[PDB]
């Protein structure tokens, strides 16, 4: 994994989940 998610992958992160934001 690469970012925050449901499914932990390697290291400490999960998926590269599509976290698009503004505010």
From Swiss-Prot:
Crosslinked positions (Isoaspartyl glycine isopeptide (Gly-Asp)): 1-9
UniProt effect for mutating residue 15 to A: Loss of Astexin-1 production. No change in thermostability
Transmembrane stretches, start-end: none
Superkingdom classification of source: Bacteria
PTM annotation, UniProt: This lasso peptide is probably hydrolyzed to a linear form by the isopeptidase AtxE1, in vivo.
Impact noted for substituting residue 14 to W: No change in thermostability
Site description Important for stabilization of the lasso structure, residues in chain: 14-15
Protein's job: Shows weak antimicrobial activity against its phylogenetic relative Caulobacter crescentus. Does not show activity against other bacteria tested (E.coli, Vibrio sp, Burkhoderia thailandensis, and Salmonella newport).
Domain comment as written in the entry: Is composed of a ring composed by 9 residues, a loop and a C-terminal tail. The peptide is threaded when the C-terminal tail is inserted throught the isopeptide-bonded ring.
Name of protein: Astexin-1
